Amino acid sequence: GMYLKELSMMPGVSGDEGKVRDFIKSKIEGLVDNLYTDVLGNLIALKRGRDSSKKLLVSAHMDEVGFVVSKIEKDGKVSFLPVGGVDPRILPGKVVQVKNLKGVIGYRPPRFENLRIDFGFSSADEAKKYVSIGDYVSFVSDYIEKNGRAVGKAFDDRAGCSVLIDVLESGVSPAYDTYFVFTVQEESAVVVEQLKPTCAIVVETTTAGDNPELEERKWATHLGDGPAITFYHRGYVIPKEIFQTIVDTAKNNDIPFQMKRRTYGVPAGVISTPARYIHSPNSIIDLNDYENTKKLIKVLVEEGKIVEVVS
Template sequence: MRDLLKKLTEAPGISGFEDEIRNLMMDELEGHVDEMEVDNMGNMIALKKGKEGGKRVMLAAHMDEIGLMIRYIDKNGFIKFSKIGGINDQMLLNQEVTIYTSNGTLTGVIGSKPPHRMKEAERKKVISYEDMFIDIGASDREEAESMVKLGDPIIVNQDFTELGKSLVKGKALDNRVGCAVLIEVMKQAETDATLYGVGTVQEEVGLKGAKTSAFKINPDMAIALDVTISGDHPGIKEDEAPAKAGKGPAIILADASGRGILTHPKVKELLISAADEEGIPYQLEVSEGGTTDASAIHLTREGIPTGVISPPTRYIHTPVSVVNVEDVENAVKLILAVLKRI
């Protein structure tokens, strides 16, 4: 699992630019599924056929990660950028980035006004991304425009690293964790159901790929594979995020205070009973925070019973997210146990 997570996190793929991560996932699944296709939105849909007349089950993991995009180049060759997805400005400053251009990749650094030239009131404020810029070493706008173009995607650089015995750190664990779970389940699944493994696009900017792929597949049941906040570190109260790394994947009962998904009772019962009967560790979560592809899937057509399985992950939406590999492996075990019961 560690090797797969490393491979997935190292691949780029901000929202709308998921080609490389999609190709990697398709390479991993080659020979393990009956069919694969890329739909009009760019979703990867892998099919594993079940028994005739069996249920149709959709597993969805979004491929995209948060990132940046070039929106302006000033006369001195410095780049202004827009944020793609939910990014806290304070994590951007002084980071090294990779810009993906039509001619290959190049490195830049995010800078801003130096603190030595800030007034006292300025030093106490979080610097807005609008006051930052990317330095690619260009001497003027003309040289910069020969190197990059407006709309080029940008990713903050971070290496994949093991922390201690069971933890790993990397960029884009939201949601390459879900992608890794999807790949392993599709490889190992034994079920009477017809199984659709979907790598969705543009989740971070509106659950877009989930909407179109769920409409196309129209499954009898769906499970979204994502991550959730691990509240086991300083600065967060236990009641704000009770899930903890190393205690098993979280079965989400509700997110966004119910404005996202309220897990279908039959799906909830199936997930919990499978975990209990197989002795797979799990946690239950009612979240007031963000949401997942499940929110779009369960409202498709006349409604699709949907659940969410999410390994707890520290520092989500930063380049240094941390997950317990055992939680990821237990998420795979839980979904396989569920599929055997369908």
């Protein structure tokens, strides 16, 4: 079926994506022709196509924002440093976890040095039996799904990963050798140099409502309006040919889509599932949008027009 619930809830902070990688592997092993972990930790799955003369690369990121244990205090509390972009102002009272041990961020009895995680210890010695400097701390969150909307954490980009797994579970017959890549944060010139793709499709999640006080509820990427097709990304060379192929594929397959509105070295396209923040770490996705994203990726893969337009 779908594993968004497990993907979302599972811990996999940048630099510590092992459990997420192991999970994805267990779900796609018998669905792909080849599957391996490259030297940086990226999971590379191959689905050979009718034509092996060209390669399509489709990718999603496994990592999420989090923290790292920087110090264990003599009273059992732990200090931490951010891993990714985190506003310390909203952290007090947040539940987090370190190696399956739940804790809560609070002030020490707008900085990280002023925050402490309380797991319930009284001494540094007690804390050490469960915790250590360098361990990864992730947010704790539930995943609830009702009336077509789902709420949980790390939808950016665990929804993208889930989309790829679902395309594979649905049984896909690619036009060209297609690599499904699940990436990690490294310490991409590598993945492209090793696979030499003709072109790439990056599957992301784009989240609106970042700033509640100055949020844009009308001129933004919206829940329910379909996957967003990026026109300009600055990080990826998105030629007109690719942009238009994606749009035409959508229109000819009756797949709703919207333009991307935000407040590798090879030709690429970017497709995003819309998300909206509710109470960070959590955000919301619309399941119809998710399904349309999956539909669009599957058609792009089976037709191969996206590969043919740049070669």
